[PDB]
Amino acid sequence: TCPFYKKIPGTGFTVDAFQYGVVEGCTAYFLTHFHSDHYAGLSKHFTFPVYCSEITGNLLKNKLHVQEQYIHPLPLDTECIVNGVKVVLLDANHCPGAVMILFYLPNGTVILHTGDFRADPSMERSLLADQKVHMLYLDTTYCSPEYTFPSQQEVIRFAINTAFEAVTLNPHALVVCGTYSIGKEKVFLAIADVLGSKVGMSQEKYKTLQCLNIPEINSLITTDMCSSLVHLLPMMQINFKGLQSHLKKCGGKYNQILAFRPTGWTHSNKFTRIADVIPQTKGNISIYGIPYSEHSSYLEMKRFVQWLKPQKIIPTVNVGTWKSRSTMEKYFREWKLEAGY
Template sequence: MMPLFADASAPSPTKEGEGEEELFPHNGYDYDAEDDALSGVVLLNEEGFPLELAGEDDAKNGAEGSEKTPGKGEFAADFYLCGTDWSCLLPEDCSGSVKLKRGDLVHDPMPSGKKLKQVNLLQIWGLKKNSDEDSFSASSIDYKQSLSGNFDAGDGGGILSGKKSVKAESWESMSRDVQTHSVKSNHFRERMNNGDVNRRSPACPFYKKIPGTAFTVDAFRYGCIEGCSAYFLSHFHSDHYGGLGKKWSHGPIYCTPLTARLVQMCLSVNPLYICPLELNIKQVIEGVTVTLLEANHCPGAALIHFYLPNGQCYLHTGDFRASKQMQDYPLLVNQHVNILYLDTTYCNPKYKFPPQETVLNYVVKITDNHLKKQPRTLVVVGAYSIGKECVYRAISKALKAKIYANASRRRILQAFGWSELSDSLCTNGNNTFLHVLPMASLRFERLKDYLKTYEDQFTAVLAFRPTGWTFNQKIGNHLELIKPISKGNITIYGVPYSEHSSFTELREFVQYLKPDKIIPTVNIWNEANREKMKSYFRDWLRG
């Protein structure tokens, strides 16, 4: 008998929980900002959309005033160019100030503050080529020594003229530090040019590798993985596709057709590397029979079923919401699963979600009742880049309302190829009461500002935050006990609509499959969590 639980002990990741759900609070994957910079991954804006979608503008309507169209040069560019503040090197009562412009030191005659900054973090890290105008080095500072032993910055007597000045030794020390750093940056760039970046890429963890094959699942941020000839993507959420971008060239990417369209459209991956596989169709890849099954997560998400020539069978769930219907999947009925790679986002007994349909009916009921009392209410549903579509579609269908979303989201929704959804979208926020916003926008101040854009049309906001993290044990399935939070004319409901399996659903799924071995893929970095999950798995399989 194979061991029940693979001990996924590993050093703690550099950063936990970046967020496609909240936006990804359950993300247990290694993450480092430098990984993205090295791999050419597309950065996401605060809405969870790839910044490369910025070319399309919304139709001119009331929404423009409240939502920025995502674009290059917003947060990411500002952050990486913001640099390091060295103001402490200047005298406290210096009468002038220094400001940086495109990497050069210039004089600011106004005493508005004392600043001395290295402006380009990419340059510091060696990730951007130095140019004459971007370089910050001792040679770019035009200074001369005065008779008094002080330095002047260029022609105007500048920052160091007057009563206070920086001594020559201070400038010389700064120059030495900058030159030393320049040598280090050049060395790093040389290593990159020579292809010596492997030691900067984190090692691919074992639970992303399929034993007995040359396959990995959701392992794109690890670069070119030794021995891997096929890369599988379970769904289009950034904690799973992280590492994919237009520079991807490490091997074929297998995923569902819907995910394939999003990978090409949003991440600009070369289509030669994208290999779409239809659901429920067996495909033989390098001698292994691979079948993708509906995962009941976000659009395009799939369970990945591997059947090896030696008779071993492995099932990788990616992210999924287990359901009774899955027990009727022919492959799961007829083939014993030896190893189950399990989405354990909510593997905790306190999470016992109500059925999705129950939550949707509740949301529609609350919306209908609210509109009857206050017809001029703007209804907002929080969502991720993809996911939660069922919530606003349920309202749209029941109340016969169009759905407004900004241009970036509309482009993604239309890529699903669902005619009913595409036909229900509208481009002008004034033409419908039903709007979709990023989950992060469901805060009172943001919603208040958003409402101002439509103040001629609406007088109040009713918002829904549909996520499993809002689940309350005391309420359970009694959704009528949910108490919204209100502030003025803004009301927000947290509803336990989850696209991940609850604890009870995980238990039922495992007890149905009875796998020989379970490998959890989420929340594994804490030893206490691993031990708890191990005990749960043992109990489930004994039952």
Template sequence: MEEEPKRSKPSPAISSSCPPMALEITTDGRLPLSDELDENGFPVGPLSSSSFDDGGGDRGGDPQIEASIASTSDFASDFYRCGTDWSCLAEESSAGKENRELVQRDLFQMWGIKKPADGWGSGSGSLVSSPSRKTRRRMIGGAGGGDRVDQEVPQLKRMRFDRGSDRLPVCPFYKKIPGTPFTVDAFRHGPIEGCSAYFLSHFHHDHYGGLGKKWSHGPIYCTPLTARLVKMCLSVNALYIRPLELDAEHVIEGTKVTLLEANHCPGAALIHFRLSNGQIHLHTGDFRACKQMESYPLLLSHHINVLYLDTTYCNPKYRFPPKEDVVDFIVRTARKCLEKQPKTLIAVGAYSIGKEHVYAAISQALEVPIYTDSSRRRILQSFDWPELSRKLCSCGRTSPLHVLPISFLRHENLSEYLKTYKQQYAAVLAFRPTGWTYSGTTGNQLDLIKPSSKGNITIYGVPYSEHSSFPELRDFVKFLKPDKIIPTVNAGNPTSREKMQAYFREWLKS
């Protein structure tokens, strides 16, 4: 992963980005699936056409929204029509009922898969079923992206799975922009029917996964910096890469598209789509909402109909401080440590891109260069960030500031790493900057953070995140007041979805 350990993606359709799922297969090799599934993996058939009161006002029956998604499945149509309360729409199958209504179901029911008698886990999304002698477990969809089926199961053909990796699951509808031939961060699915433009929000693996030198399915639209990384790191043919400058309107397939700064990693963008029918969709990709976004002219002057929202930290417990405050704390801590032990090696954890402001601030404050390996230096030098490029060095012995993979920052690893530099340094001070390092601290309480120390190795987990905190998400939604919110993160089970929908309804009331 190139990002913070992220959470399962929304799972309305089984895709290669979904966590592995254990399915019970009976002795005759059949899955108890419903008779028909649409291209998104949902039961087909007419669903209720009534509007839904989501607690935030009646948003049902908008003819513009319905027209823009006329080509999608019945489920997708109801999804876009039902306001913010979209959780687990499924058909009520009560005998004798002519007028069918939509009810909330868990994901297995929504896919038409019968729930085993011994249970499939709890609301947390864990899978704990134990197969009997008459059943066998099969894993469908691994973290590595390749879909694996150990034996031929005819029913899987309805869900567009095949043996091996020759055929991929279809793109889930929530990655498609209805009313357009566009998809966002949907590269794992091969050529997508009806898609003539593929958008990439930023250069993190869980978003660009599927791109490579063999890509030939259509043009890739992204920021210039992301375009350079796609070409340099993934060897994608330059003929398919279409960089779009930030804050400039581009007309693509009849839709006006504008990329806005996302305050995430370098090159990340919010994607603003203005459809020919007047509908406006805003896809945040991954972002950290801030007050500056409330001054974006495009967001001030145009009402957002559909918001695709990065909900990584859509939980009230995540109230970490502003990035600037966390960086100041890191710099203060580094200085204090060096005063006590001048022969201290400072290590900062980072992904292939992201967290640059942390080690750039330390470098500036301590007036020392930044050591990274050659691969990271090559990436950083492509940013067109002269102040940072000038500070990079290629020898670890000439600088006490080292940038390392964030997953490497463990006591045992750092102890071994220190042995390489035992002539220069006697201790290691490491910082793991991630919002997942939650300490309950805000504001000036950062000084209450307790490090983890073993011998001469000290590791600080600091709440520095490039995703929005809960209050920042709330303020952003209240500023935009969109008609509909589609969470793109942590929507993998009914419990989390229902909680997020409750937050959305509350935010949209005011």
């Protein structure tokens, strides 16, 4: 049964609610982004209207085979009417095609559902600036002050400088980057660009990337592994055994691997700066865990909420334990008392 925090009161709508069967009273199913915990349940046999971004709709059609007649893509930053209710999709600064949804209820209530997001001050100048928001359905993934991480720009600077140094010292080094979902494409695209290479990958991953409207993509990626010195592999193969095995497959073209695992947060964040990050090494294989996040840090989340000043907050992440829920509610009250709303 669908939980309350996935339902939008006063409408026929649900958000990211495809694993509960036919939801009673639901006339339209919204999907914020193409990540499996959110799409879980969709397939070619789904016959209700799905509302989403253009990019999410490309992925539904091509990867899950949802039929076209049930996919309703909406443009961003544009007022649209869905089953008698005004809605707007906004960029969530998460993975490609990820959106936040603004619902303008018939009684005058305005609700923002963030989906998954990485808050940014640029959001303070979107269509959010123009009216009051009463209820916030908030991505609380990292809602505790211990969660600090660097900007995406500092992390990509580190990665580019690390890869360029290694390959210039040893032109026979291969760079490998792990992946298991869409998102974080900048990591592997920025490294391939500094090296003058395409990124090589499986046919299945190439297909997925071709759905993303990324500019000039045919110029940056390939299925010809032999021509590429940056390879993408499944995240589960980014370990010493998996990488040794890959290096064997390359036929003596390479004699060293430098590999990257983009994690979100790891407790090495509470002590060490990005500048100071070191790899795990075994023989001719080094693995770097880099803190590339597509979710808000604690401070970014706090700034957004203190700017928006909602009347009520509904967390959508970390809701399964009483300790988590109590921690989050304490921070929400602090924020409100400090800012004065």
